[PDB]
Write a protein that binds this ligand. Structure first.
Ligand code: HEM
Ligand code: HEM
Ligand SMILES: Fc1cccc([C@@H]2C[C@H]2CNCCc2ccnc(-n3ccnc3)n2)c1
Ligand SMILES: Fc1cccc([C@@H]2C[C@H]2CNCCc2ccnc(-n3ccnc3)n2)c1
Ligand SMILES: C[C@H](O)[C@H](O)[C@H]1CNc2nc(N)[nH]c(=O)c2N1
Ligand SMILES: C[C@H](O)[C@H](O)[C@H]1CNc2nc(N)[nH]c(=O)c2N1
Ligand SMILES: [Zn+2]
Lengths: 411, 407
C-alpha cells in the first residue's frame, strides 16, 4: 500500500511506502484522531524478534544482508539472549541505532543533520560521579566554544528495571524555578518541582532569575546525587535587541546548548533510560516558548510596556508585535556572540528539503505536523502547507515517567 | 474508551464521552496518523434517518414519546415508498445548527445555535437560486453588523438533479494569468475565473474584480449572475500608522461565505448550502494576503517598511505579517464591519470547548485547523489537546462541479 502526501503551496506530491515498516501504535483509530495529544523489565520471549528486526535493518544499510557476518551475529545474539536474558550491541550497532532514533523522531525539525551525530559510549559507566564526568565532557564537546556539535551520551541499558541509570534533570542545562510565599514565581516556572527536589537533596540555591540547576544523577538504580556543572562549561548569552537599547536592561540571558536528558532510547529491544542528547536551538524555542508562554518567563507584557504598545485591546496585536521583537533579539544576540542558532524560516525550509530527500531515498519520513510547525508565523513557513504522515519507527526516542514518581528510595 | 483532554497551560482536564457516538471514519489507523492530510439506497437511508430523528427527539426531551415514535414510522413509511424523504422545518434547522456544531475545523462554533436558516428547498431555477443568495448576502451583511446564515437548496435525488453553486465562496476576487507569466488578482481563482469567461463573463481584468455567481439548478447547465455591488460590502485596507499603506491598493470583502460544501442530515444530501459567518482577522491578513500561492504581498510590504530583507534571520517576514494583520483588523473596525482577532476567537473557542464538554460530553476539534496561522503558541488553543472525530449531521467536502457535470 502506497500513500501520497501533498504540499499545497508547491503542488509537489510524495509517496510513502516506509509506513509499512511501522510496528508501534499512534494512539489513533479509524474513529478518532489523537494527533494533538502530547502523550497517547522485558522478557526473552519478545526480545529476539526485536533484536532480529533491528540487526536486519543494520545489515541492509551496510549492504550485508544475508551475509555470513549477518547470520553469525544473528546467531550470536540469539545465544547470548537465552543464556543471559539480554544482549550487548557492538559499537557499530549502537552508533547506527542512535542516528536512526534521531532520524525517526517525527517531532524533530532538525533531522536534516541526522547523519552527523557524535555518539559517546558511556556503557562502561557505573557511578553517578562517573555519569557527571561523562556529561561534562558531553557539554564541553557539544558546546565547542559556541560552534555547536550534535552529540549523545549513552549510559548502560536497563536490566531488570531495578538498576536503571537516569538523569533526573529534563535538560542538562536549565534554570531554577522558585515558588514564592506570595504565589508568584522566581525564575523558570517549568522547573519549580525539579528545583524543589534539588534543594531538598541538599542543593544550596542562590535564588535568582537565572540559576543553572545542578545535575541530579542516578546510576545502577541507586539514589541520585547532585553535581554542579563547572560554570565555565555553561555557555550563556545575554539577550539584547539590535534597535531597542532598553532590551538589554530586561536582564535576560539564556544558555546555548539545548540538551534533552529525560528520554528513553530504544535500540533492538534494548532500553537506554539515560541517553542525554544535544543539538542547537531553533530561535522560537527560546523566543516564543521559553520567554513568552504564559506558564514560563512571560515577558510579553513587560516587553510590550517598554515598547509603548496599545495594550488596551488585543485587536491591536500588541502581543503578536512584542513576540516578534523578542524573537528578533534572541537571534541577534546569539549571532553576535557566535553561538550556533537557527531561525524558524531557515530550519523549516531545510526540513522540507530533508523530508523530500527522505521520500526519495527511504520511501518516507515520519513527521508530526503539530510539532514540526513553528509556534509563531506558522503559515509563512513552508511546513504549514506540507501534509505529513505520522508513524512510529524503531530505533526510537520515547517518553518515560519522571524518575521521582517511580524510584525506590534506598536511603 | 472514555478519553481525557488536557490543557497544558492551565492543567484543566476534560473527559470526552461524545466521541463514542462517532459514526464516520478519520482516515487514521493505529499505525498511521493522517491528522494533517487535507482530505482523508433505502436500506442505507432509514438507519441514517433514525439516528438523526432519535437525537433530534432527544434534544427536545420527547425521546421515546409518541410524537417521536410516530415520526419514526411516518419517515420509515415515506422511505419505503418514495425511496427518499423530506425534513420538517424544525428538523432542518436543528440539523443545520448541528452540522455547524460538529464542524471540527471551525473555530467560531461558540455561536453555533444562533444560525439563521433559509429554507430554499422550493427553488427550481438558477434565477431563483440567485434571488435566494442575494437575500442571504443582504441579510447576513446587515450593513456591516454580520449575522451567521445558511440557505439550503433542494436535496440531491438521483445525482442527476444536483443543485450546485460553482463558486467556492459567494464573494471572491477573480484571478488572471498574464502573458507576463505572472498572476494578476487572486491566484486561487485563476481556473474559476477561466470558466467564468468560458461561460461568457466579461472580465474587467483588475486586481480585485468581484467574481460573478455561477449557479446550477436541478442538474442543468450553470448560469452567470452578477451580485448587485451595493450588496457586496468591501473594506479599503489602511494601516493605523503607515500612511503609505493605502497606496498598496488593498481591499477585502466583508462577507465570508463558504458555498462549495455538502450538508448531510439524516442521510439526506444538500449539495448546495451556502453559509456565512464573519472573518477571523488572520483568514484575510495571513492566508489571503501573505500565502505564497495567493496575493503574496509580503515582499512589497517589507520593501515599503525598509526592512533588511537580506536574511531570513531578521524576521522581516514576521514583522510585516503582524503590521498587515493589524491593518486588517484596523480597517474593518474603522468601517464598523464585524471581524474578530485570533486572540479573542481562540479564547472564545476555549470557553466553547468547556461548555461543550460540560453540556454534551465533548467537542470534536481539529487542532491543525483551530490554531491560527500566526502567533500559534500565544493563543490559548495551542496548549489545548483536542480530539478529532466526525459527528453527523455534517458539512463534508465534495468534488468541484466542473469535473462532474454532465454537460
Ligand atoms: C541539531 C539541531 C536540532 C534542531 C534545530 C532540533 C530541533 C528540534 C525542535 C525545535 C524540537 C521541538 C522541541 C519542543 O518543542 O519541545 C525538537 C524535538 C526533538 N528533537 Fe531535535 N533538534 C536538533 C537536534 C536533535 C538531536 C541531536 C536529536 C537526538 C539525537 C534530536 C531529537 C529530537 C527528539 C527525540 C525531539 C522530540 C522531543 C520530545 O518529544 O519532547 N534533535 N527538535
Ligand atoms: C460566525 C463566526 C465564524 C467564525 C469566526 C468562523 C471561523 C472559521 C475559521 C477561521 C475557519 C478556518 C477556515 C480556513 O482556514 O479555511 C472556519 C472553517 C469552517 N467553518 Fe466557520 N466560522 C464562523 C461561522 C461559521 C458558520 C455559520 C458555519 C456553518 C453554519 C461554519 C462552519 C465552518 C466549516 C464547516 C469550516 C470548515 C470548512 C473547510 O473545511 O474548508 N462557520 N471557520
Ligand atoms: F510530553 C510532555 C509533557 C509535558 C511537557 C513536555 C515538554 C515538551 C517536552 C519538551 N520537549 C523537548 C524540549 C527541548 C529542550 C531542549 N532541547 C531540545 N532539543 C534538543 C535537540 N532537539 C530538541 N528540546 C512534554
Ligand atoms: F482541501 C482543500 C483544497 C483546496 C482548498 C481548500 C481550502 C481550505 C478550504 C477552504 N476553507 C474555507 C475557507 C473560508 C472562506 C470564507 N469563509 C469561511 N468561513 C466562513 C465561516 N466559516 C468559514 N471559510 C481546501
Ligand atoms: C496540546 C498540544 O498538542 C501541545 O501544546 C503541543 C502543540 N505543538 C507543539 N509543538 C512543539 N514543537 N512543542 C510543543 O511543546 C508543542 N505542544
Ligand atoms: C498541510 C496542512 O494540513 C494544511 O496546510 C492545513 C493546515 N491548517 C490549516 N488551517 C486552516 N484554518 N486552514 C487551512 O487551510 C489549513 N491548511
Ligand atoms: Zn490521527
Amino acid at each position: 500500500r502506497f500513500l501520497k502526501v501533498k504540499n499545497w503551496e508547491t503542488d509537489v506530491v510524495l509517496t510513502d511506502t516506509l509506513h509499512l515498516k511501522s510496528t508501534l501504535e499512534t494512539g489513533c483509530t479509524e474513529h478518532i484522531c489523537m494527533g494533538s495529544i502530547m502523550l497517547p523489565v522485558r522478557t526473552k520471549d519478545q526480545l529476539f524478534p526485536l533484536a532480529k528486526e533491528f540487526l536486519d535493518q543494520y545489515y541492509s544499510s551496510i549492504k550485508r544482508f544475508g551475509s555470513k557476518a549477518h547470520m553469525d551475529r544473528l546467531e550470536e545474539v540469539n545465544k547470548e539472549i537465552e543464556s543471559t536474558s539480554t544482549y550487548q550491541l557492538k559499537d557499530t550497532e549502537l552508533i547506527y541505532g542512535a542516528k536512526h532514533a534521531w532520524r525517526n523522531a517525527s517531532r524533530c525539525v532538525g533531522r536534516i543533520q541526522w547523519s552527523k551525530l557524535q555518539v559517546f559510549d558511556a556503557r562502561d559507566c557505573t557511578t553517578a560521579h562517573g555519569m557527571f564526568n561523562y556529561i561534562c565532557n558531553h557539554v564541553k564537546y557539544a558546546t565547542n566554544k559556541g560552534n555547536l556539535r550534535s552529540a549523545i551520551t549513552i549510559f548502560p541499558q536497563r536490566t531488570d528495571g531495578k538498576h536503571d541509570f537516569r538523569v533526573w534533570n529534563s535538560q542538562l542545562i536549565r534554570y531554577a524555578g522558585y515558588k514564592q510565599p506570595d504565589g508568584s514565581t522566581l525564575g523558570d516556572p517549568a522547573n519549580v518541582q525539579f528545583t524543589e527536589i534539588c534543594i531538598q537533596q541538599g542543593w544550596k540555591a542562590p535564588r535568582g532569575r537565572f540559576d543553572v540547576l545542578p545535575l541530579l544523577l542516578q546510576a545502577n538504580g541507586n539514589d541520585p546525587e547532585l553535581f554542579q556543572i563547572p560554570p565555565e562549561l555553561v555557555l550563556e548569552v545575554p539577550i539584547r535587541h539590535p534597535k531597542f537599547d532598553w532590551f538589554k536592561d530586561l536582564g535576560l540571558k539564556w544558555y546555548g546548548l539545548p540538551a534533552v536528558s529525560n528520554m528513553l532510547l530504544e535500540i533492538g529491544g534494548l532500553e537506554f533510560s539515560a541517553c542525554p542528547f544535544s543539538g542547537w536551538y531553533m530561535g522560537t524555542e527560546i523566543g516564543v516558548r521559553d520567554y513568552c508562554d504564559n506558564s514560563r518567563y512571560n515577558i510579553l507584557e513587560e516587553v510590550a510596556k517598554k515598547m509603548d504598545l496599545d495594550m488596551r485591546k488585543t485587536s491591536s496585536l500588541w502581543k503578536d508585535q512584542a513576540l516578534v521583537e523578542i524573537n528578533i533579539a534572541v537571534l541577534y544576540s546569539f549571532q553576535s556572540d557566535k553561538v550556533t542558532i537557527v531561525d524558524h524560516h531557515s530550519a523549516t525550509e531545510s526540513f522540507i528539503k530533508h523530508m523530500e530527500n527522505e521520500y526519495r531515498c527511504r520511501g518516507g519520513c515520519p513527521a508530526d505536523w503539530v510539532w514540526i510547525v513553528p509556534p509563531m508565523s506558522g503559515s509563512i513557513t513552508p511546513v504549514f502547507h506540507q501534509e505529513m504522515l505520522n508513524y512510529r519507527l524503531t530505533p526510537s526516542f520515547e517518553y518515560q515517567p519522571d524518575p521521582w514518581n517511580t524510584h525506590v528510595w534506598k536511603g
